[PDB]
């Protein structure tokens, strides 16, 4: 039995062959990534003499349709970013090849997990975190351009790639999960560790959900470890609550899924639910002040007396993160204002 004249496996994926040449132009090197959508391969573009990443979408209508939306968002961004100055990997071109949609990007070689793994998950410096944070806030600034109003919806270390000159810069990839404000209203979205309270609570959401993800990611960049590593949605919300306390009553009163996590008392206040069975630190007592080590030399005490890691520096970082982790999406800090924060001065 053959699929797509022998080009596909039994799962609608193009059968990648190291060394194959596509259209006398792309010399396929190796598989670099894979997922439900298809595959990403490393290839050498002989015409432009440069390494590229090619995202090969499955020969399957559902994934083709998803990726056609992705292409339209990338092309929209290209129309607003002729200088490629916003830390988003640029779509160079797209084409159909043997019944697969192919998106071609400049080739980057590492993600943020790779960088953290090289620190043995001890985290990078506050100085490097500051540079990456400014770059990510600049990307979010661009996405909130009114005509764009793009919600990435899947910010996580795997979708943040490193630029080849090392410690210079990161760039965002994977807009296959993204939508525009008021175009898709899917409810179980974001990667769980980076999932905002509004999404957990089943409430309406906007571009502020990406700023929540970014706050979580920035803490993880500096500490080496995920801030909120929930094994399921209840564990996820409970780990958020350990750090930030019970969400405001005016939010829980409007939340479809409030009762998945909390119970309203006759007093009108909200508490965590309890179970006949896990055990959590009391609400708000796992202080970000101590996660970051503001007064104790940073994470693990490893930054004691290091330039750019003074108590004053840590207090500005802590303040920015808490502004990104505001429970209220209407008052959570927005990209332009984050970029004006004293942490970046
Ligand atoms: C077990 C981990 N293995 C080995 C380590 N490896 C890290 C890694 C990841 C990516 C690259 N290279 C690269 N360069 C430019 C690009 F634009 C994309 C790109 C574009 C897209 F549109 C994507 N859409 C999705 C879903 N992905 C995912 C693959 C992130 C996209 C990636 N990728 N190099 C290394 C991961 C796999």
Numbering used by the authors: 134 to 410, 413 to 480
What are the paper's exact sentences on this?
HIPKs belong to the CMGC group of serine/threonine kinases and are part of the dual-specificity tyrosine phosphorylation-regulated kinase (DYRK) family. DYRKs are named after their characteristic dual-specificity, as they auto-phosphorylate a conserved tyrosine in their activation loop, but phosphorylate substrates on serine and threonine residues. HIPKs are regulators of various signaling pathways and involved in the pathology of cancer, chronic fibrosis, diabetes, and multiple neurodegenerative diseases. Based on a database search, we identified abemaciclib, an FDA-approved Cdk4/Cdk6 inhibitor used for the treatment of metastatic breast cancer, as potent inhibitor of HIPK2, HIPK3, and DYRK1A.
Similar as in Cdk6, abemaciclib interacts intensively via its central 2-aminopyrimidine group with the hinge region of HIPK3 and DYRK1A. The backbone amino and carbonyl groups of L241 in DYRK1A form hydrogen bonds with the three nitrogen atoms of the aminopyrimidine-pyridine unit. At the benzimidazole head, the fluorine atom forms H-bonds with the catalytic lysine K188 and the coordinating glutamate E203 of the αC helix in DYRK1A, which is in the ‘in’-position. The G-loop is fully ordered and no additional ion, as e.g., the chloride in the active site of DYRK1A with inhibitor DJM20054, is seen in our structure. Towards the rear part of the compound, the pyridine and the piperazine ring form hydrophobic interactions with I165 at the G-loop. In addition, the positively charged piperazine ring is stabilized by lying against a solvent-exposed rim consisting of N244 and D247 at the transition between the N- and C-lobe. Moreover, two tightly packed citrate molecules were identified in the high-resolution structure of DYRK1A, keeping the active site open like a clamp at the nucleotide exit position. Two negatively charged carboxy groups of one citrate molecule align to the position, where otherwise the γ-phosphate of ATP is located and the transition to the Ser/Thr residue of the substrate takes place. Strikingly, our in vitro data show that DYRK1A is inhibited by abemaciclib (IC50 93 nM) to the same extent as Cdk4/CycD3 (IC50 78 nM) and Cdk6/CycD3 (IC50 116 nM).
